[PDB]
Structure formats: structure tokens, C-alpha cells
Amino acid sequence: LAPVNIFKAGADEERAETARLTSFIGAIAIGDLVKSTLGPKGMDKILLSSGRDASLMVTNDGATILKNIGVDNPAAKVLVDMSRVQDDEVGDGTTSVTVLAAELLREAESLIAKKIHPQTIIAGWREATKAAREALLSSAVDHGSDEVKFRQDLMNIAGTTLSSKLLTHHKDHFTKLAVEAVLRLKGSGNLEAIHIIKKLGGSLADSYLDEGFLLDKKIGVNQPKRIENAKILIANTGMDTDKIKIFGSRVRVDSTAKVAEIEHAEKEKMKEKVERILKHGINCFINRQLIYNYPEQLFGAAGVMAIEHADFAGVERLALVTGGEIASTFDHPELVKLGSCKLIEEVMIGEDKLIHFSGVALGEACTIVLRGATQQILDEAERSLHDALCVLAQTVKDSRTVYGGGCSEMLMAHAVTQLANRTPGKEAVAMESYAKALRMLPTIIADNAGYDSADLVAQLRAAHSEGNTTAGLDMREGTIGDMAILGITESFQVKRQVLLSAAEAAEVILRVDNIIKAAPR
Template structure:
């Protein structure tokens, strides 16, 4: 078939990329070592990170780029699952095309199957947001399930507790930017902890009070040194030391005038993105203003959001500048380093997660794991609907779609069956990565589901069929639905290609 011959290379490239990623799926998935051209290394099993940093010249990588970015930003987790599902759908489509089934018929079957799968998911999902205690338990189980395939798996209970507590501190806010993550080398990942308030990785000036109550905060991104002459090659010649002294005095006067303008704002805490030199720091201290210098840009952006203050670059009109506010600003010790905490009566509740670990690569991977779990948890606050994990939902969809395919007598039914097999193969990949007999366990799980056991799932640790509610295996409903929608849309785009031009 002409179409098949032209797209053989495309199918091969897709299977090559997905084959590289799918070994990372599941709680027993393997990690990948990524080495950049500069020699920087990343050790990760995060599907989004792998696909973003590998296969630079690969045509499939370019097709996947938008999907990866959208999926990672929208859901935060499940990139490996959706990639594996795309790979399975393409493999099944390749078999159907090989027996002379037109791609448009396959697309039609896939769309019908996806629509039915979404309907099935709606019928089996559950929500307990009215019962606060049970909802918190589900959030804890959801966090543990998300972290099962991450590097923090041995201490997932500890991290799940920290992350749920962090999300609940936001009081319904789903923006995880208000949960600051600080990475510090030392100790073990079990030593990671959650701190109240927003912590800025900086310190207060010399000789200044280390605790301020009812803080009015002026946040700035401006230079407090002398104004530089920016005309290239400009020189100033003086004939006497007195003239040089007058230039120096005038220069210092400009700097102190800028400091006086800061005083007129009525703030008692001044946070600057750039350096604050000793003379300016001493001048501000004499007027009772605590100065914090060289704050990182991302830090002052978040501080502005949390305290409600504006980031300014000029101090000429104090009446037009909005100051931030919090109850207490204090200097604290984190891992033997001085940092500043902003806490109490913040505009938006915030907290800080301090991650500990033995190496920078470990800290980076823990941060990626934490980010994925936080995204899922924040999404569950917005849409508190869940489905059972451990392969329960996938096998249930497989059985229902098998029955659904019998309603069609055309070639479309073969495409629907192919879709159902792709869903089932996700469980197969997960079990094969764990070195478990996938055929036997999937057969047992199918039997349990057919007998009406709605919570049956696979316990990889004991290698048998168990109850998902007892194991605490819960997945986000939105993650499952988005996985199916994104996979079908991407595969449809791929199957519609009949010519590749270079």
C-alpha cells in the first residue's frame, strides 16, 4: 500500500522515541541519563524532561513538542503515560494499515472509542469533596500514587504529607507559584521539610534588626550605586584634587538623594533585586529601614504576588507606588544559611518547601517529582473527581470498549478493538517494567472486573490482585480524560500525513 510505504519511516521514528521513554513508566520504571553538549547531566524518569532534552533532530520530537508543553502545564503529570498510549495507538494503526484498512477508517474508530471511553470514565468516577476528612485522605492517596513512579518513592508518605499540607495552606488557591521550593545540598531527602510563609534566599543588612513586625515592604529592581556615564569613550579630566573631590561629593549626593526618596515612601523594609552598597545600607539603617539586597528575580516576583506590593524602578512619585504588607519579617536559619521569612497576614497564603539531598542531580529530580505532584493536587482542588488506579480504570475501559466494538460490523470495529488493546497495553508496559508476569496478572484482573469487583487493581509489590481503596491507589479523573483526548488528537494528526517533504 502506497500510504504505508511512505509513512513507514514516520511510524519507525515514533516507535523509536516511545520505546526510549516507555521503560520509565510505573513504580519500577528506570531512569535515563541525559548529557548535554556542554557536559551537563540530568538523571530523570520524567517523560516531559526526557522528551524535551532528547532527540533534537528527530521529526517526532518536533511533533510532540507542543503536546508535551501543553500537557505538562495543564495537568503536570502523566506525560509518559500519554506518550506510551500514542505509541501503542500508532503500532495498532500500523497493523491495521498493513491489512489494507484506510487511515480515515482507523481515525473514525479511534474517535468513536475515545468518545465512549470518556463516557465510561464519567460513569465510574467518584468525588468526596463534601466530606472534608475523606477528601483530605483522597488527596493524600493521590499524592502517594503520583509519587510512586518518582525518585522519592521510598519516602512517598513523608512527601505526600508535606505536599498535601502545602496545597491546603493556599486555602483554595490553585496557583502553585505560591509554594516556593528551595533546594539545599546536605542530609537526605527524608530531611526535607515545609516552612510557614514565604522564604527569600537572602539576608538582612549588617547591624539591622532581625525581626520586623507590621512590615511595610518596598520592592525594587534598581541600582543604588552612582549613575554611570554610558557614552563610550567619555573621559573627565581634572587639574586639581579639589575638583576630583567635588565630583565625588556630587556623585555621593545623587546616591543619598535616591535613598531619601526611598524614606519618603514610609516603608520599613526595602527589598532590592540589585546590590545595596555599605553607605546606602548604613543610611537606610539610621532611618529605621531594614534593607535586603540581591534578591533573585523570581523571588521578588513571587514576593510581590504574596505581599501585594509593586516592583518599582524609580522612587519619584511615592503616592503612585503600592507597598507590600505582612505581619512579620524575620531572619531565620535554613541548613546553616541565613534567609528571610515573610509571614502573617499575607495577601495570598504562601509556604516554602525546603528539599534536602546529597547531590544537585538528586535535588533537581526531586524538584521535578514534587512539581508534578503539586500540579496534580492543585488540579484536584479545582476538579475533585477521581478514578481508581493500579490498572483498574485501564482494564475496565478495555472490557467496556470490547463490548462496544460489537455494535459495529464494519472495519470500524477493528479500530475500536485496536484502541481498547492500546489502553490495556499501558498496564502491560507497567508490569513488564516491574519484571512481573503481565499476561497472568492482567487475566486475573480482567476476571475480577468481570465479576463486578469495581475496585480490583494490581498490587505490584505482592504480585497479585488487590483492592485499590485499601492500597490507596487513586488517579485524577482529569488526567485520564486528558490523556485519551490528547493521544487521539495527536495520532489523528500523524495518520493524516501521507507525504513527508524535506
């Protein structure tokens, strides 16, 4: 360091050795913290806090843990941001991509320690990623016309996604529930229509899927409970003190009789508006705002169900389930239309009363009632269900599946090895390191399972080199079996995005030098 001071007091700067060492240490720590929850037989962690309101959550996803930990290393922050971007993209593979990035950085550490230029390593990694993305497209199964095989593929994908979390005990029912809930969207990618209601009472065996719709709201006073063959009409107006006029109207009279006449005129206008609302020939009114005492009794005197407290999400869900539109003004009853329902009642789930809506016509949206004993278990089940729904929507929009379990990684490693075995130079070390980092994932999976990892990896590599380019790893016993016989199937776009994000993160962190830190506030 130069004796002349340049930076301000309280600002350190790492050159090349210390900066790279700290980055590699942080990357290894990040990769090892989440490495325990990667294989199918992984466990769960505890993420307790003290600065908030003593929040305690137990989950198995890696992105959630990385976001709740709150790291301070610059490379760890980039890894957390990449994991968050991946979770917001497809949300299915964060631990895998972060483990691949950690392994790539660990290999780059030893490569730099062997006096190798970083540009050659970057070029070799780019060539390996290109070869992997070229060989992965050729090993994809296209489907869409055959619905019988498509349903089986979707069921297998949902089962494989659910067997990697806490739903392994009830995968036999949750997979079918998710499959039935996905088909109700009619190809629509709107994930906000699926409402998840978690309750504290029963276990996971008491969970089911309602064929209609449920609402956790209350009805008015002196109103009929069960109404058979009704017509739901969603509205959007302000019944509670109708003063939408933004004018500067002020009562400047000089007698109480004029004020009484103005109040009577306002009441008559409210009554006329209520009558115009019921002029459509309906019997189940639903508003988005609050209902006072006059409109409540006005609707109850005619036998019309009134529902209060409804946000935009509930209104959209009701419109997607029934078929009506968000009407207002109430002047042309012909251009408003209604819904369709023949069964409306109130059920009691545990200790609360909810309105049950059955006998729908369309049914684009649906609700899922979750039951659990602990809040952490309920949160884990909700997260697993959301991830399963997301991966199902992704594999439906992709219309192509890829055999998972570890066959794609082995094929990519074999392609990288075949590409490296034909070109000389110093680029063969980067491709070998990439192949080792790709093959280390089945090794870590087998180590977390509890079987011999090296022997199984060697057998799988020998099979893939001799011809068996479709086998994987049996988790029920610890042997080598075909992936097309068991029922393990992943996706293509998810794996492609994972590989691209891992390659981008590796290329970004590989060219990192001079970590200049400013003065902390």
C-alpha cells in the first residue's frame, strides 16, 4: 500500500488475492448452508427472528431461506438476487442452480490456483454451456395432441414436484387435487384465481378441493340464508352515504323545515337507486364497499341476499366462477347480464361460518381449503402447493417434457466431455470442471439420500457412455433403473433457465477484482 492516504477514514479495499479468497469463501458457505436440503430425502430448517414480532417459519425452499437470512457478502447478495429472480421466473429450481454455481466457483478457484487465465476459463465455460443447451433440445419429448398421455405426464410431474417436500405422505391425493385445480383454469395463466384458505383444525388428510366457491364473509341482518336458484349480480357503487359529487354544494338555508325536506329528498333518492338496482330482477346483491342500515333493510325487505366487504380479488374470483360482470350506473338492464347458481348455503368449517357456492356454470376459478396443526406446517404446505401449481402451469404452457432424475445432467456432462475430447489448448480444463460440477449434483443427491454416491455415479456414467441414455437413480431402494418406467419427469424450460442463470452467475463472479467498500452510515 502507498504511504499517501487516498481513501477516507473507514473504507477498506481488497486487491486480487484477498478479494477472490473472500468471494470463494462466501460462495462455499452459501452453497454448503443449503446443500443439506437438495435431495428428495432432505430435511427442514428453522428461520427464527428477533427484530420483528418473533416470527417462526419452517420451509424447505432455498430461495425463501436465502431471502430471510439476510447475508452481507457481495457475492452472497448476487447469489440471493439470482435465486430470487429464478423463483419469480418459474419458481422450481433454486437450490440446484445455487449448488451448481457454488461448484463452478469452487472449480474456478482451483483453476486459478493452477495458474490459468480467467479468459480461457470463461471461453471454455461458454462453450460447455452452448454444447449443453444444444444437446438438451435434442432430448425433449413433445406432447399436446394425445390428452391421455398428457394427463399422465402432468400427474407424474406433479407427483415428482410434491415428493421433494413435506407432502410425500399425502402425495397420493395432493397430486390429483393440483391436477384437478389446474384443468379448471381452461388454459388461463392467471394464478391469482386460485384462492388458498388455510385453517387450524384437521390434518393433511382432511384437505380437499371444493367444486364450487367459498367465501369468508357475513350476510346482512333479517336476510334469507339458503336461496335456491339465485342470480348473482356483482356491482360497484357507493351505497354508504352516496355523495360522489365533488362539487362545493353546501346547504345554506334558514329553517329546519328545509333541512328536513333535503334529508327526505336524499332518502327518496337512495330508495329510488335501491329500486333501480333491484330492477334487473335479481335476488343476490353483491357490493364492493360497505352497507349501512337503510340499504341493508331495503334489501332485506324484498328477500335479496346482500354481501359486504369484497375487494378486487374476490370480485374477480366471483366473476370468473359465475359469469356476471362488474356493473354500475343501473340504467340499461339488457347490457348487464347475470350469473348462474342453483345451490347457495352456509357451512361450518371448524369454528367459523363460510358461505358455500355450488351449482356453478363456468367455473374458471376455484378455492383450496388447507388444514394443519401448526402454522409452520400450513405455510410449508401452502408454499409446496404454490410451487406445484406454478411448475404445472409452466409445463403446460411449454407443451414439452424432459425426463428428470439426473438424466439431463448426465447427458450434458457427456456432451461437454465429447466436445472437450476434440479440441486442444487450455480450454479442456474449463469443460472438465463444468462436467465435474454437473456430475456432482447426483453425487450430492445420493449422499443426502444415504447410499453409495461414487459407485452409482460411475455406473450411471458408464451406462450413458455405453448407450443407456435414459436411466436415472432409484430413490426407493438405491439402484439404477429406467426413468420411463418409474414415473419421474421434470421440465425443459426450467432446466434451461437454471443452466443459463448458473452460467451467467459463474461468468459474472469469475471476473471480479478490486472490491472497493465505501464508508458505512
